[PDB]
Nucleic acid binder design. Sequence first.
RNA 1: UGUAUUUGUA
Length: 371
Amino acid sequence: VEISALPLRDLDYIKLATDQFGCRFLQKKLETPSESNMVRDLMYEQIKPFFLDLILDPFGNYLVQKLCDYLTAEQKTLLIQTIYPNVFQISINQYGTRSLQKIIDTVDNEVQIDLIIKGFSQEFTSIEQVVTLINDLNGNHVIQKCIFKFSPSKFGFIIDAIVEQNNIITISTHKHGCCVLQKLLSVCTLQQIFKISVKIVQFLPGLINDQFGNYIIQFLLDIKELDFYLLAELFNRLSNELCQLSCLKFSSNVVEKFIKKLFRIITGFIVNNVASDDVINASMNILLTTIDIFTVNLNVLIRDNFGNYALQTLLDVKNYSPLLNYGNFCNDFSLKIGNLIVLTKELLPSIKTTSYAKKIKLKVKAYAEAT
RNA sequence: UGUAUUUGUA
């Protein structure tokens, strides 16, 4: 009110910074073209010893963020030089996370990025602390910002934290961690995906029927570059428990996605008469083996609250109609799937009670109409 | 008959 009458040279910037209306006033001044540079430079010299304090402040964080839109490269580098050792403390802070996201979002150069990355390194931030950040209500937004803003060549501290011991569990089975991990996997390098997948496969039993972990397995199954090993690797680890996994709430979805993936690979090959040959040969043997397992365990699966979905997915002629040495396979498939259909039809009166009997009957009928 | 989305910081 009378503050606006004073010359900028005489303002008490640190006091204004932590005050709501003082802070709004400074932001307006930064948005004032005639005075922007001068208020920026004057403010900067007075508030620089308090960079960390302001970043964490309920009102100061708004000033710091605004400042990011106006700071010179020199000014921003000095700011980052001041606070990089404190990135953990900042990231878990409800105000700090907003400040740091903005800072990352407006980096000028590689020097600034490397300083930030240095702060997240083990010199200043422990692996345990990085895991905490990944799962933290506030911190996970900072990790995600790094993931989308920085080159994957900088992802070292994140990869290291994930693959350490059993941290893959701690992260994949967490509400926030599961989402962060998917973001990471969508942009990181193939070799970085491999290192994480090794750990995911190693701890598969603690992931496959987890409420969040199951989404991670499914995410891997959508990465085509993993086909050459992931299919066989997953099936080798799980084949003996395939029926039980099919009958559980969360893992049943993983089974369905796995089966649909097998169908899509094999049919895509046949349409072209596209995945590599070895991916295709592997898929054929697993599908046939899967049909055998579902055939043996048909009585449990058709009756189970979750298993019936996996069964229906395997039975759906929409998934495999082109399938009705590709010559020998297509012949073996038609035989095994036809046998499963007739066994299913025989069982229909035994599940008359269930609400999904008609759906299974329709699929049986659809098979007949196609053959 | 079947699963996740955090942030409306003044």
